[PDB]
Amino acid sequence: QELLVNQNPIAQPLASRRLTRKLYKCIKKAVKQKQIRRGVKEVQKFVNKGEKGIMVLAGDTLPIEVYCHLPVMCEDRNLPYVYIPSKTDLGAAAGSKRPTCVIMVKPHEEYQEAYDECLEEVQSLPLPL
Amino acid sequence: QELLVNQNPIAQPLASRRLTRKLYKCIKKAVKQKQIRRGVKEVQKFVNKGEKGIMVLAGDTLPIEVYCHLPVMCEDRNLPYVYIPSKTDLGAAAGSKRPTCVIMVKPHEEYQEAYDECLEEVQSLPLPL
Amino acid sequence: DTSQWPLLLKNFDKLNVRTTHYTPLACGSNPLKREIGDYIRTGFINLDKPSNPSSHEVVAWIRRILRVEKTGHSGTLDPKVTGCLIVCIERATRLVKSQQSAGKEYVGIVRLHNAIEGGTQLSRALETLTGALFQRPPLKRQLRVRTIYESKMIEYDPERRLGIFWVSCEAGTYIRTLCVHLGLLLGVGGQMQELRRVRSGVMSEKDHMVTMHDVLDAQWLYDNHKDESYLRRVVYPLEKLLTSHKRLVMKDSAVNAICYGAKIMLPGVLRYEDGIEVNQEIVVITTKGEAICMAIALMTTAVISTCDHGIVAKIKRVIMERDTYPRKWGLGPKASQKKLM
Amino acid sequence: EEFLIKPESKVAKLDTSQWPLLLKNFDKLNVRTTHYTPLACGSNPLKREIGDYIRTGFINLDKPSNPSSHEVVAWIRRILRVEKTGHSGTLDPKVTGCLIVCIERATRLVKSQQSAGKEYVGIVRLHNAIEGGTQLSRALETLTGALFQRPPRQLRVRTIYESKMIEYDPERRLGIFWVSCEAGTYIRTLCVHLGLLLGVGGQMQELRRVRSGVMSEKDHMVTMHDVLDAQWLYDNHKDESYLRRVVYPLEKLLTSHKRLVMKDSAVNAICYGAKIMLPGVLRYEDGIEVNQEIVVITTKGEAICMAIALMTTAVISTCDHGIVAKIKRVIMERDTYPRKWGLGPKASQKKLMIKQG
Amino acid sequence: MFLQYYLNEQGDRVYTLKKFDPMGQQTCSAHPARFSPDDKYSRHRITIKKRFKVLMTQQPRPVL
Amino acid sequence: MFLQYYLNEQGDRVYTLKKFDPMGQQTCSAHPARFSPDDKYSRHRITIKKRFKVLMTQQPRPVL
Amino acid sequence: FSQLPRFLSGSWSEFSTQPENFLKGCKWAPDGSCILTNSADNILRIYNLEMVPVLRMVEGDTIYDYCWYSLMSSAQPDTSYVASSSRENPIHIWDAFTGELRASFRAYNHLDELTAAHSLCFSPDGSQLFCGFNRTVRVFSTARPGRDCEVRATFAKKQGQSGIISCIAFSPAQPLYACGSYGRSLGLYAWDDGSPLALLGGHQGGITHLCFHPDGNRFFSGARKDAELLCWDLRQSGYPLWSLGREVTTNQRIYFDLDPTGQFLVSGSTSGAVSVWDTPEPVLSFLPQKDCTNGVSLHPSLPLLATASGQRVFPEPTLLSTRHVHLECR
Amino acid sequence: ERVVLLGEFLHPCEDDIVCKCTTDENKVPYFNAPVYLENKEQIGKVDEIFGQLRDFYFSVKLSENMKASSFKKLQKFYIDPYKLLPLQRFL
Amino acid sequence: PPERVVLLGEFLHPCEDDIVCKCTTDENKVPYFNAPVYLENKEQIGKVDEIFGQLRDFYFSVKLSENMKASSFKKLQKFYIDPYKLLPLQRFLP
RNA sequence: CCUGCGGCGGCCGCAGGAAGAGGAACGGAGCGAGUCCCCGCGGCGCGAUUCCCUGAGCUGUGGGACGUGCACCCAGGACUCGGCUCACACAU
């Protein structure tokens, strides 16, 4: 099922269809360990203190003022980010029923090749003006 | 390889492909000696003092205000002239990488027959009208 | 059909009609159709400055070849800087100050001394320099504030370390210092390599620009063939740079009174424009369409719709010459009874 | 060709239909006289300098669900660096809605804004099942009009004009109700009464305010982030274009009343407190009644105060002298325009005659 | 929170309790976002809103 | 002198630092030609521009 | 130099990636640890002794000159750094071990503009860093790097030596130093005050190189298109004493030098033929390759030698660069 | 002491019962005013008053934990005329 | 040296043998030109030369004193200035 | 008596005024001067051996040396005037 409806005006840069599954599996394998971050609040308190990694944002969240500052603190610290279509599916991948709008992934040895492949994929995305 | 693009609106009269090669060889033979003139400054300075010869002009020089007065400065003295497609190739024939717009070829006995046939061909060129 | 009518007279149909009765005169002329003697005396040139000469010398050349008395420019450009320059011929030097303080634009090139990550870092460093900023003369040591409305990144060349930036700024700001500050910000270093003004005030570089080979050719052609079809395409009337102001149409008997120095009065007003506020600079135009003076408004566009007399504006600067219309003040329904007394 | 504005003889009418908020349609106003001297004081409400523009402004704000109204007001006052600030009516610290926020000089009509018809939308939850879906609507239509209420303790009476339910969920026992009520009406007590009528019991879970007086949600609504963003943008870039989209002049609250234009000299006298006497009147709107609430304004279109009409439109059309209206609430600052009243023919001869004896 | 809405063609809120517009689009939350008085990310919000041109300044002026 | 430019479909300068159009054409320099106050070739410039119909007079009039 | 020095090793593969490229000189370290190489990519290379560089110090537009530190003991990291000048950039100083930038010296015009230095050279005590500008030289100090300097006027308002100063050298014998300009003149200036004490001439082209003899009395000079190598002296004042012969066809610097012992003089040529003398009588002449030979350096400790190759090509409408090292026998 | 008619049975709530207030010229009773039957034993005290001005209701909490089934679909409570107030006081 | 010193700013990174310091001082006061900069020990380390940045939160740089290196300083650092040197920003407000 | 503000529907306290509502030229322009602000290692042409140069030195759409000449280094704004001129104007 691929319906690209009800997207935020700031949805770009949206992820590709296959990058969705790759990020899903990476987030799963990161949830199997304690190297994962959930919730906007934890995202601010743990991005400010360094902890370079990957941040995945939901593409169908309204209002947009709940998390709009993340895509600027990223460039203030040169961190990558990417948007994904749904938040219910993102929460299901994160391991709960209640959905979430932001997920932050940290590196680890078990999924290191997949994490590096996703990290190089993210930085190769086109840049909207 | 003859693409007729990026030419000034005052390009005419345009030299043909074979005639272009003949002029390039003549310029080579002339620059073998010190019988040559390079640059608008030198050509303009030495047209005033006579020194009849052949003038060749770059067909893609922009803006045209740097050398636009030469096609009629020649007419005031009844001198022949013609346009060659490129300036980089003209500089190469002169014996340099950096291009130039105007080269003024003077006669000498070593290349007299080729120079003469080029001269008689130039006078035989037609007009756009 | 009224949108095709000329400048400072375009779309006059969409004005507030106060009265429709006045006595038309035969004096005065349209701005574009003036005699070539005065069409040049009241005009500006939207130049394209060359590199080698200074700014107070290009206008000297323009004066000495046009054979006029006084000239002034919009913004002083240092030598090796090109782009839009607005030169005003003596009867136009009145409007110089409204031109010397306007919204300039620029395009330049900065030479970074050491290698950086890429163009994104420099664009971010540009974005962090927008709004009111401190400045200092490139060469009296004083610190002042200037504003930069916008910025952008055109291209980056990693091999040569060359970056092109577009800047929308104000009058008085120094790009030769903005580049030093931008170099200090990235840590590597910087200098200003290229500079060119793209927009000065209202006259952009998209339309109506001429080089100084056009100005000389027009003068030569006029002086020799007595043909002025080419000067009309190089010089433009004053009204071209007053098209954004608020208009005020009058009648013939008031024009010479205003030119002598009488404050605008509601009996003389013929049409007024929607959107006039107090202490707002407006333009007072003739029925032909012609810049009489620069007027500081004194009655909101609604007060005018109610009252019947009194000061409507005071003049900041008057443009036309003293005797262009005959003296027609002192004879009307009023102001003649007081003479009988 | 030749371009010139030809002279005509036919009259041409003005078109003030698209004029600003309170300057609208002076052409429709009946005219008494047009002979006066205007001064260079005041300004159009929409074009005031930003300082004076935020002092006499208001914010149609969307109230966040965590804090209380008195806390939100203090937040806004701290953000804008203003001295005084009121609100359109207290809301529970958990409900959301539209909350008009009168800035320093617009507080003078906070009492008139509070006592205005309000609208609400909310969710009621039932403790047990109901026969069907329309039973809630039926029990909602039964309880409407003038009603007995208590503060959730002296019993008080309020009225409810109309009500409607949107939909009801048989699984969570949840329904959405839309109500229109006067100021001060309690909705928690409304839910309790609904439960008691149904014989099941209920409570208020969610409640949002839709209409607050003249300003609604289908309007220039502003969130709390917008005020901080506007103030920071002004402070940093010196760009006022974002403040003027959150702050509106107080005259937008006064666009349903009757108008009465006034001379420039008659302005400052009323501000100091004085009757509204006939010579100052210039234009007046038709349809005025006796003991009616009218707003008198300056020529520039800015409201000066609020008045209670004494003469009707016909009497004021055909009259020699008298008293037009009595002050109700003075809005403008006192010395905006200069004060000049003792000067004039009648007043001058009066204070001259009494001077002699 | 349980209050959901979806805009119709006239451009006014239509409050509902479900999660999907009968035409098949998700519904927004009727309540605004929570606010912290000591917020510092105005620049970060302004920059993106400008960049995607959804800022309230870029919108047409209201009718008056 | 590094600054170049080329014109897009709408007809305004698209500044670039390369030496070729994205469609393979050369890019003009962004500066005007050097000027000398006492130039003597005005007649020569005018006659050629007239001959090739590229003089500014033959261009259509601007709207005003 | 009994006969035909032997071929030890070389480096040629890296330069092949460029469609056109050539080498622009070579220098041994003041102790013999490693070599310095310049290319047409503005990239510096250090080889330690097919050779492969240990460092690649990318630069800006065009590198005018470079030099090793005047002490350069490899045991201490604090003395192992290399100076460099580019077309517009200031005087970069790099770390010779990890290949990272360390400091920067800056030259500013009277209108507050950055003027690059065309020739730079350290001092025998190692504290100062002289530079070469148009009609002036700007003294510096390695301690306290920055924009402060001490302007020395090569060409006074009336007289002096004009042109771009292109080479600076020092004399171990007396406190004296000399400079060379593109205006075909050689100057002599005292160290302490800087007052000129002589001037020189006799070249047919822009002087591109200087050198000195261990005694200090003798010193030599080269040019850009002059076939001679003048042999001067500081005792007689009869400016020209002897002359030599070489082929200089193009407008590029051709490197010559003098052996550590003080008697053998080697020089390159445009045809690509290296030639040797003895101190003014030729001894040997051999052809390392067919292309041009511009850079020649002599190892200070052991008998060794290296040559660089490359030249511009001028085409018309309608051949490799190599670095070599050779073993000699003083 | 003789007492005046107050209300009738409508339906039982989860805790209390809901009563329709019919009385002389629609007088409003006191809060928590004791309510009696014709046999004079008290049933409880009125919890709160609600409804329209002209026709309003009131709910009484039960006493002694009687089951709601003890009341017939339409019975008729009684209250003393002393403990009540006139309608026109509020209007 | 003065008897008392005031917070001036924090070290951010060096640029061409010059240290670039963020300005975090009480209120928005701005330093003079050629004003000596002191460390926690009240010892001179440089002089303020170049002030730049927005009016709200601006930067400034320091020209290091004799025998001082731009690598001695930490990523986050803290500098002090003589209070007799600063001037209010109301002058630079409109 | 009226209005504004504060205090515990009303009362108290302080503050502002006491008010019928004027004036169809009062008070300007264009200049000039003084005081402040604004902001001579350059620019152009010519001559002389083809005056030199395709330098890795920017550059022939130009760069440099010698003789030469030339032109450009202002115009606007505020304050004062113990200054000149034109007017003192409700627009038939």
Side-chain angles (χ1 to χ4, degrees), chain C residues 110 122 125-126 128-129 133-137 143-144 148 174-187 189-191, chain I residues 15 20 49-54 59 61:
Chain C
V110 59
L122 182 55
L126 265 185
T128 64
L129 279 185
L133 309 171
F134 292 83
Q135 289 290 325
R136 218 208 182 202
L143 183 63
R144 65 216 71 190
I148 295 178
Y174 302 111
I175 313 297
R176 257 199 69 192
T177 314
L178 164 72
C179 278
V180 170
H181 294 166
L182 186 50
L184 268 164
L185 193 63
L186 280 189
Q191 287 288 85
Chain I
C15 167
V20 174
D49 54 349
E50 187 81 8
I51 302 108
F52 64 99
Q54 289 184 356
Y59 307 78
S61 71

Side-chain angles (χ1 to χ4, degrees), chain C residues 20 22 30 33 272 306-307, chain D residues 1-2 5 8 14 36:
Chain C
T20 58
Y22 71 108
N30 278 314
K33 304 177 199 54
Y272 53 99
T306 65
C307 192
Chain D
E1 292 179 338
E2 191 76 330
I5 305 168
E8 293 193 351
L14 272 75
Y36 68 98

Side-chain angles (χ1 to χ4, degrees), chain G residues 36-81:
Chain G
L36 195 41
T37 300
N38 196 344
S39 166
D41 288 355
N42 302 301
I43 309 183
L44 281 78
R45 273 82 181 267
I46 297 169
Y47 293 109
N48 207 342
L49 190 146
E50 163 205 324
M51 294 182 286
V52 166
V54 303
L55 296 173
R56 288 170 183 162
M57 294 182 286
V58 182
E59 276 281 337
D61 210 24
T62 285
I63 304 165
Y64 297 166
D65 209 22
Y66 45 71
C67 187
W68 280 107
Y69 183 44
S70 160
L71 315 178
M72 186 66 204
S73 307
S74 181
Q76 327 176 71
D78 64 282
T79 49
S80 178
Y81 53 86

Side-chain angles (χ1 to χ4, degrees), chain I residues 12-68:
Chain I
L12 184 62
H13 57 261
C15 167
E16 283 165 46
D17 303 358
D18 284 329
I19 62 170
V20 174
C21 299
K22 190 68 154 278
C23 183
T24 49
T25 172
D26 16 32
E27 325 199 330
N28 271 349
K29 286 180 176 290
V30 174
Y32 282 168
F33 181 70
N34 276 329
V37 173
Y38 294 106
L39 201 60
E40 293 83 3
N41 290 318
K42 202 172 302 191
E43 291 325 326
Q44 213 184 310
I45 72 168
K47 279 143 79 205
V48 163
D49 54 349
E50 187 81 8
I51 302 108
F52 64 99
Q54 289 184 356
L55 188 62
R56 296 286 95 166
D57 43 354
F58 63 96
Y59 307 78
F60 74 111
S61 71
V62 179
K63 148 193 171 194
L64 302 183
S65 47
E66 202 80 53
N67 60 89
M68 202 68 40

